[PDB]
Every structure is written in structure tokens, then in C-alpha cells.
Design a protein around this ligand. Structure first.
Ligand SMILES: *[C@@H]1O[C@H](CO[C@@H]2O[C@@H](C)[C@@H](O)[C@@H](O)[C@@H]2O)[C@@H](O[C@@H]2O[C@H](CO)[C@@H](O)[C@H](O)[C@H]2NC(C)=O)[C@H](O)[C@H]1NC(C)=O
Ligand SMILES: *[C@@H]1[C@H](O)[C@@H](O)[C@H](O)[C@@H](C(=O)O)[C@H]1NCCCCCCCCN=[N+]=[N-]
Ligand SMILES: *[C@@H]1O[C@H](CO)[C@@H](O)[C@H](O)[C@H]1NC(C)=O
Ligand SMILES: *[C@@H]1O[C@H](CO)[C@@H](O)[C@H](O)[C@H]1NC(C)=O
Ligand SMILES: *[C@@H]1O[C@H](CO)[C@@H](O)[C@H](O)[C@H]1NC(C)=O
Length: 508
């Protein structure tokens, strides 16, 4: 019997996630050679980014702590040409990359990608500078795409006695003020591994003071209510958890949210079977509980954000992280994050080096992009709860929110269920009363074509998802179900279901 009964708990929200719950990163290493930031001038890229608004865009990564703002820095042919062609035109409406520059950067990018990826497993780590032009490219991409920029500041600029030296950051904040930029900030990326990365140990207590120091500069600036997030610690292993704890004791008062990072797997060792294994899905929970214990002990009630997360570290799992099979991890992460109290989840990455990107080297969306877009259109901010009657809840995983009321097909009271089937057979879900005789819109995602779960294309209710063109996302077409039908979920698939006229009081 492949018929599973659902229970729903709709009396009140367990949590309220941010409208920007599904957020994204651009790795700081895209600036290592800043020419490649010009790639963000693509209209195709903007079209795609806009589909994910509202969202935070976090500019940050390992390179965060090896980047230096230099207002005097000299521009390349590519940058001068990009900027010269934007003059006298509405950059958000009409901005594009000169074709010669676009072609040059697309030719160089695979090499650049290899270089950036190898800098991971390289022992050495070098400084680079970036110009005002680089900052401008990033701001305009975020602003034009309806995204909120979070900019990670370099925490390895140090005084003689290992306090954070804030003079470079001050030059940047001055520059951003003078331009009217609405930007939020971080300081440092994964400080827990600064010893490994730079021969310098900063403890959490010291990092707290560096944050307080940065806070004082943001209170002085022309944007007095600029938000500040931190500390962007890695996976909460014991040592990292202790660093977080001491950080929150010292400087937890001045952060608007606590940021930490999570990866399921090592990209070099991950298997296809790891991507489908509910034990691998379940370990994320352990991490979440350890983070909330640390936060509850030190700053109870403080918002908790996943500041950088993906399927696998090291740039992703070759041939796995860019496939339909990557969706189980992504959707389950969002599901669990929402249900356990995480307010924002920042996907590593929207675009850039690695194959855990949502959008590839050709600016084509991968299956996780479409998964993200569907999530964004259907799933509301109020998190409710669903469960499966039985003890095989490991392989049939179910989440329930109020329906996104910005969606014009639906209304207040409506419910959005999403579910993951990791069994190797079809399962059929029975909705509970009073949702057992409603019109229900199915949104089932399945891999296209011979590679199956390892495919990089996906269908929505039997229809291939593709950009209509560079300016235009397609409609996402529902499949109406017969009222009172069970909800069919094929083997190794995931789906959304919108329960229309559900009239849930909590969703109003
Ligand atoms: C398919 O999965 C089963 C385990 O899942 C159960 O059986 C499915 C057919 C379906 O009825 C699900 O809803 C069930 O939850 C695999 O069999 C297990 O394999 C493991 C690991 O090899 C073994 O240790 C267990 O003893 C097996 N359990 C059972 C109940 O048979 C089966 O091999 C899978 N089929 C494949 C990979 O083709
Ligand atoms: C986050 C980082 O900021 C990004 O710049 C990287 O591209 C990204 C990635 O690896 O893809 C990510 N780095 C996380 C590093 C993972 C550390 C875990 C190592 C565990 C080894 N344990 N021991 N001992
Ligand atoms: C990077 O630059 C800063 C400031 O100039 C310096 O203190 C730091 O040691 C440099 N690190 C490397 C690896 O070059
Ligand atoms: C901080 O850095 C600036 C810019 O490099 C340097 O000129 C200044 O002396 C440093 N201050 C301290 C206290 O180290
Ligand atoms: C943290 O670092 C400071 C100096 O930066 C040091 O004096 C202090 O003892 C350290 N505290 C702990 C708990 O390690």
C-alpha cells in the first residue's frame, strides 16, 4: 500500500520566515579578477535574478577576507567599455554588455572557473584589490534585479595587536554613502578557519569587538540603520560552535541576525546515492539544533540565518550538484529551515564558479533555479506543519505553508504543500478534512530525458521548463486535480500542491 494519509496543523504559524527567505549568494571570488563582475551586466542574468525577488544577495566567500577596496585602482578595457556603453540609458531597463566584451569573457571564463575552484584546495591565498567600478557593477545588478545587497567586509586587516583595522572598510562606507547606496554588511567569512587560511587565529571574543567597532562606524554613516549580520561561521563543529558562542557573548548585541553556513557533503567524495539518502538530509537537523542551542544560551530570540549553504563544499559535486537530483537537498533544506526557525537561507550560489550554481556559465537555469522559482511563487511566509501517518516519514517528506498571497491566482486562506518522495515507487497522499474536497493545483517536477535524476533539464507537469527568451520567464502552469483525488508523487520526485479555498484562518 502506497497510499499515505497526511495530517495538517493549521491553527497557527510555527514561524514566520522573511519574504526574502529564499536568498542567494555571489561568491566574493568573482572579484579576484574584477573583469568577470561585468558578466552581471547580462539582461538574461537580470531576468533570472528578478524572478527570485524579494531576496538578499550576499557578496561573500573565502575571498571576502582577501579583498581590499582601492579607489585609485586602474580599470581594464572590459570595464571601461562596459561603463561607456551604459551612459545616457536606463541601466536597469536597457543595460547590456558590449558583444566583444561578452564574447571575450565567455571565452576566458572556463579557465577562470578552473583557477577559482583550485584556489580552494590551494594552500596559498593572495590579496586582490577592487575599484569603485566593481562596487557599482554589484550594486546596480542587485538594485536592478530587486535584490538587497549584503556586502562582506575583510576581517583579516589587522592592527599590531590583532584588532580589526577598520580604515579600508571606512573608505568603502564613505564611498557607498557618497553614492546613496542602500547596502547591508557583514565582516568576515568562516572565521573559524582563519588559522588554516591565513596563519592568524582570531577568537570569537575578539571578533565580537571587531563587530562592535564596525557597528560604531555604521551608526556614524549617512545610512544609520544599515543592517549588520554575522559572524558567518562554518559548519557548527564543536570548535566553531565555541567560537560562535564567544562571538555572541561579546558582540551579539550589535548584529541583526546570526549567520552560519552548512554543506551536506564534500564535493570531491559525494555520490549519487548520497544525494538521495534521507540520512544525509537528516544530519542537517543536528546542525540546526546545535546552532539554536548556542544562540538561545547567548542571544535568545535573535534571528538565525543560513548565510551560505549548498549541496556540497569545494564548488559542488561534479555531475550531481547541477542536476534534478540536487533538488531533494535544496527543497528539504528550505522545508526544514522554515519549520525549525531559520528566517533566511542564502543559496551558494546564484551564478559563478562551481556547479552548485542556480544558473550556468551560459546564464541558463539549472533545475534548482526552476525549483527556486516555483518555491518563490507558491510558498508563503507563514510556516505551518504537515506529517505523514506512519513511521516511514524519512523518505516521504512534507512541508506546509500558507500560500504566497502575492500570487494572483490564489487567495488568503490558501495552503501550499510541498513534498519529496525518496521511495523508488510512486506514493499517493490523502489530504485530511477539511481539505479533502478542494480544488488542488499540482506542480510536479521531473527530470527530462535519458540521464533521469542526473539530467540538467526539468519538466513541470510534463512541460519542459525553459526561458522563453533572454527577457522572459515562462508561465508556470498548474495541473488542476479532481477534487477529492489523492496527490500522486512518482518515485524520486518533488512537487507543490496549492489547496484552493482552503480558508485557513492563520493564513489571512
Ligand atoms: C527500493 O527500496 C527498497 C526499500 O524501500 C522499501 O521498498 C520499496 C520498494 C517501497 O515499498 C518503499 O516504500 C519501502 O520503504 C530497497 O530494499 C532495501 O534495500 C536495502 C539496502 O540495499 C536493504 O538493506 C533492505 O533490507 C531492503 N528493504 C526492503 C524492505 O526490501 C530496494 O532494494 C530498492 N530497490 C532498488 C534500489 O531497485
Ligand atoms: C563557503 C565559502 O565562503 C565559499 O567561498 C566556497 O566556494 C564554498 C565551497 O566550499 O564551495 C564554502 N566553503 C566551505 C568550506 C567547507 C569546510 C568543511 C571542511 C571539513 C573538514 N573537516 N575537518 N577536519
Ligand atoms: C593582505 O594585505 C593586508 C593589508 O595590506 C596585509 O596586512 C596582509 O598581511 C596581506 N596578506 C597577504 C596574504 O598578502
Ligand atoms: C590601519 O591601516 C591603515 C591603512 O593601511 C594604516 O595606514 C594604519 O597605520 C593602520 N592602523 C593601525 C592601528 O594599525
Ligand atoms: C581571546 O583573544 C584575546 C586577544 O585577542 C586574548 O587576550 C583572550 O585571552 C582570548 N580569550 C580566550 C577565551 O581565548
Amino acid at each position: 500500500q502506497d497510499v499515505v494519509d497526511l495530517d495538517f496543523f493549521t491553527q497557527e504559524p510555527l514561524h514566520l520566515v522573511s519574504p526574502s527567505f529564499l536568498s542567494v549568494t555571489i561568491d566574493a571570488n568573482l572579484a579576484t579578477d574584477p573583469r568577470f563582475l561585468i558578466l552581471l551586466g547580462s539582461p538574461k542574468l537580470r531576468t533570472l535574478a528578478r524572478g527570485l525577488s524579494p531576496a538578499y544577495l550576499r557578496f561573500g566567500g573565502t575571498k571576502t577576507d582577501f579583498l581590499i577596496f582601492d579607489p585609485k585602482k586602474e580599470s581594464t578595457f572590459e570595464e571601461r567599455s562596459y561603463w561607456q556603453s551604459q551612459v545616457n540609458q536606463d541601466i536597469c531597463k536597457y543595460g547590456s554588455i558590449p558583444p566583444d566584451v561578452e564574447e571575450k569573457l565567455r571565452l576566458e571564463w572556463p579557465y577562470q572557473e578552473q583557477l577559482l575552484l583550485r584556489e580552494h584546495y590551494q594552500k596559498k591565498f593572495k590579496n586582490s584589490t577592487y575599484s569603485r567600478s566593481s562596487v557599482d557593477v554589484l550594486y546596480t545588478f542587485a538594485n536592478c534585479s530587486g535584490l538587497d545587497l549584503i556586502f562582506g567586509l575583510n576581517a583579516l586587516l589587522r592592527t599590531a595587536d590583532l584588532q580589526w583595522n577598520s580604515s579600508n572598510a571606512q573608505l568603502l562606507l564613505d564611498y557607498c554613502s557618497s553614492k546613496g547606496y542602500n547596502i547591508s554588511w557583514e565582516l568576515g567569512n568562516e572565521p573559524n578557519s582563519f588559522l588554516k587560511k591565513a596563519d592568524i587565529f582570531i577568537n570569537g571574543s575578539q571578533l565580537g569587538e571587531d563587530f562592535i567597532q564596525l557597528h560604531k562606524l555604521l551608526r556614524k554613516s549617512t545610512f544609520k540603520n544599515a543592517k549588520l549580520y554575522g559572524p558567518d561561521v562554518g559548519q557548527p563543529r564543536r570548535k566553531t560552535a565555541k567560537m560562535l558562542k564567544s562571538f555572541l557573548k561579546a558582540g551579539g548585541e550589535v548584529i541583526d541576525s546570526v549567520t552560519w553556513h552548512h554543506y551536506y557533503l564534500n564535493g570531491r567524495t559525494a555520490t549519487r546515492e548520497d544525494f538521495l539518502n534521507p540520512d544525509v538530509l537528516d544530519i542537517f537537523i543536528s546542525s540546526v539544533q546545535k546552532v539554536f542551542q548556542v544562540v538561545e544560551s547567548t542571544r535568545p530570540g535573535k534571528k538565525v540565518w543560513l548565510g551560505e549553504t549548498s549541496s556540497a563544499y569545494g564548488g559542488g559535486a561534479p555531475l550531481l550538484s547541477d542536476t534534478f537530483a540536487a533538488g531533494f537537498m535544496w527543497l528539504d533544506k528550505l522545508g526544514l529551515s522554515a519549520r525549525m526557525g531559520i528566517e533566511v537561507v542564502m543559496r551558494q550560489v546564484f551564478f559563478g564558479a562551481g556547479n552548485y550554481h542556480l544558473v550556468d556559465e551560459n546564464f541558463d537555469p539549472l533545475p534548482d533555479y526552476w525549483l527556486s522559482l516555483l518555491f518563490k511563487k507558491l510558498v508563503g511566509t507563514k510556516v505551518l506543519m504537515a506529517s505523514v501517518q506512519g513511521s516511514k516519514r524519512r523518505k516521504l517528506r512534507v512541508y506546509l505553508h500558507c500560500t504566497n498571497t502575492d500570487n494572483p491566482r490564489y487567495k488568503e486562506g490558501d495552503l501550499t504543500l510541498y513534498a519529496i518522495n525518496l521511495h523508488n515507487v510512486t506514493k499517493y497522499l490523502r489530504l485530511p478534512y477539511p481539505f479533502s474536497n478542494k480544488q488542488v493545483d499540482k506542480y510536479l517536477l521531473r527530470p527530462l530525458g535519458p540521464h533521469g535524476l542526473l539530467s540538467k533539464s526539468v519538466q513541470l507537469n510534463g512541460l519542459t521548463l525553459k526561458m522563453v527568451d533572454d527577457q522572459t520567464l515562462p508561465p508556470l502552469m498548474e495541473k488542476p486535480l479532481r477534487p477529492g483525488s489523492s496527490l500522486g508523487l512518482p518515485a524520486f520526485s518533488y512537487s507543490f500542491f496549492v489547496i484552493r479555498n482552503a480558508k485557513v484562518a492563520a493564513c489571512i
